[PDB]
From a paper:
The coronavirus spike (S) glycoprotein promotes viral entry into host cells and is the main target of neutralizing antibodies elicited by infection or vaccination. The S protein comprises an S1 subunit, which recognizes host cell receptors, and an S2 subunit that drives viral cell membrane fusion.
(A) Cryo-EM structure viewed along two orthogonal orientations of the prefusion SARS-CoV-2 S ectodomain trimer with three S2K146 Fab fragments bound to two open RBDs and one partially closed RBD. Our cryo-EM data show that the opening of two RBDs is enough to allow three Fabs to bind to an S trimer, as the remaining closed RBD can engage an S2K146 Fab owing to its angle of approach. As S2K146 conformationally selects for open RBDs, we assessed whether the mAb could promote shedding of the S1 subunit from cell surface–expressed full-length SARS-CoV-2 S, similar to some other RBD-specific mAbs. S2K146 induced shedding of the S1 subunit as efficiently as the RBM-targeting S2E12 mAb, whereas the control mAb S2M11, which locks S in the prefusion closed state, did not. Furthermore, S2K146 Fab triggered fusogenic rearrangement of a wild-type–like S ectodomain trimer, as previously described for several SARS-CoV and SARS-CoV-2 neutralizing mAbs. Thus S2K146-mediated sarbecovirus neutralization relies on competitively blocking viral attachment to the ACE2 receptor and putative inactivation of S trimers at the surface of virions before encountering host cells.
Residue numbers in the entry:
A (entry chain G): 1 to 108
B (entry chain A): 51 to 66, 80 to 121, 125 to 140, 157 to 161, 165 to 172, 187 to 210, 215 to 242
C (entry chain F): 1 to 120
D (entry chain C): 348 to 370, 374 to 380, 383 to 469, 492 to 517, 520 to 545
Write the structure that this text describes.
Amino acid sequence: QSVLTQPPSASGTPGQRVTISCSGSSANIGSNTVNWYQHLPGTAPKLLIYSNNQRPSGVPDRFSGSKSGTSASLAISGLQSEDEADYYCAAWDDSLKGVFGGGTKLTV
Amino acid sequence: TQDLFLPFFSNVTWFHDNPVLPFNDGVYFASTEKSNIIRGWIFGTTLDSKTQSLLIVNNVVIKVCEFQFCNDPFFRVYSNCTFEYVSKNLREFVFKNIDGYFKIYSKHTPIDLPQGFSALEPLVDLPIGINITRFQTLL
Amino acid sequence: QVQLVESGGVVVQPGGSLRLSCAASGFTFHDHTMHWVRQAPGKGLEWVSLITWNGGTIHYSDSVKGRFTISRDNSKNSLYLQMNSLRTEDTALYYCAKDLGRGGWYLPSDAWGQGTLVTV
Amino acid sequence: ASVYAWNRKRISNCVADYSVLYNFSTFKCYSPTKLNDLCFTNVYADSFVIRGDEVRQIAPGQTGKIADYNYKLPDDFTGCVIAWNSNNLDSKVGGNYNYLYRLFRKSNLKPFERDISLQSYGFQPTNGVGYQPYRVVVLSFELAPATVCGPKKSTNLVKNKCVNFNFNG
Ligand SMILES: *[C@@H]1O[C@H](CO)[C@@H](O)[C@H](O)[C@H]1NC(C)=O
Ligand SMILES: *[C@@H]1O[C@H](CO)[C@@H](O)[C@H](O)[C@H]1NC(C)=O
Ligand SMILES: *[C@@H]1O[C@H](CO)[C@@H](O)[C@H](O)[C@H]1NC(C)=O
């Protein structure tokens, strides 16, 4: 029940690197930018990545991403036990308005 | 003593009139006036805002800056600065430029160029790292 | 030091209405675009609406379009969301968030409030 | 000045008695006790206001919103970075919008570049330390005969005795 498509989960050993993919139509990703959020249970979602590969203050260089074609992805390196959070893909649509994906659960 | 001096009985150019003149190891300048027309001197190289230029205008104001000078300066002298300082008769001057210092000597006496002997006392030692190859009299 | 505080997380009978309020401080209010996002229990984030700094444009998600109204008061540094014709499907944790910067807009940025729970 | 539009005060033709500064919460030189023994062609005091958590960005080898988009220092910087808390000076209730910083830029700044081509600081008296305003002055040392030098010390004059004297060198 979403437009942007993401995997239900991701996992790895601390110190390793994982990626979370995101896909949609040309009206979702192809003609727009992709933002990512890191949502730690117990509080609100926070911005992780914006405009494909930019970071807000407070977010370390272990978090980066990219956009190409009609798809986008988030890369998480140096996995820490404190990053066990739900990551979300979002973009502005040409037909619809604000679009968020289901979210990916990243676990240790 | 061994130093830069004006040779005795040397050839001296008499201006009546104020083109840009070359500057070598140092120069001698003297003027004879009744009406006090000469105001100061301009020292430097290209004098076109590309390099530092030394502008001395009689109070007495001394500036070193990237000035764009007029083709015929006289207020119409010029149109990024490193130094600024503010303070019938013959006025003798000596202008030297050694090891980053612009040295000025002078002597004023009551009165062609008169014959006689006197020594010029030092006026000021200016710590200005300026390249001087040309200068002009400002009227 | 950006802070956003939501209020109005109460229980309301289906078919009724509820207004939410977000207090804002720590940034220029009157020049910034602000957004609402809700999270239904067991689900991911669902975008609701945005209002720009000058009221120049307003956008709604289709599921709330025509039934939700967004407004702001730049003299009180506050954002409001009026949600009518409510259904049990609207049960969600509502969050107040600001955009990346002044003038323009895109999506909710880094500063999110704690949010409040709305039950229908 | 605002960090996006930091101002430069030029120091020249004077005695740089640095003991008035050395003896502030931050005083990091890139030795702070030997400043009075040095002469400079010029000294430049770059003055601006930033947040507490941005103070760490005012240094060689550092990156961040200030280091990259407002006030960049070179890896071979010579000089001293001095900073102190100004919570009771530059803060207002609701946020002091007088001070601004650059949040977005196409590319990073060069050392000592001043680009004023922009977001306000939410400076408030009740902010956490990391979000409180700090006044930062960076003293850049340019290494001419030199015009900026430390102070000279002196004693007194003793006459009619064998003494070891030094008169202006
Ligand atoms: C000075 O130079 C001129 C040529 O310009 C020459 O005719 C004159 O004899 C010279 N005078 C002396 C004393 O050398
Ligand atoms: C001349 O101006 C430039 C800026 O355009 C500056 O970088 C340079 O240092 C200035 N020159 C001097 C001697 O101050
Ligand atoms: C002239 O400029 C050169 C640099 O090209 C410098 O090394 C030299 O010392 C300068 N001379 C004077 C008299 O300033």
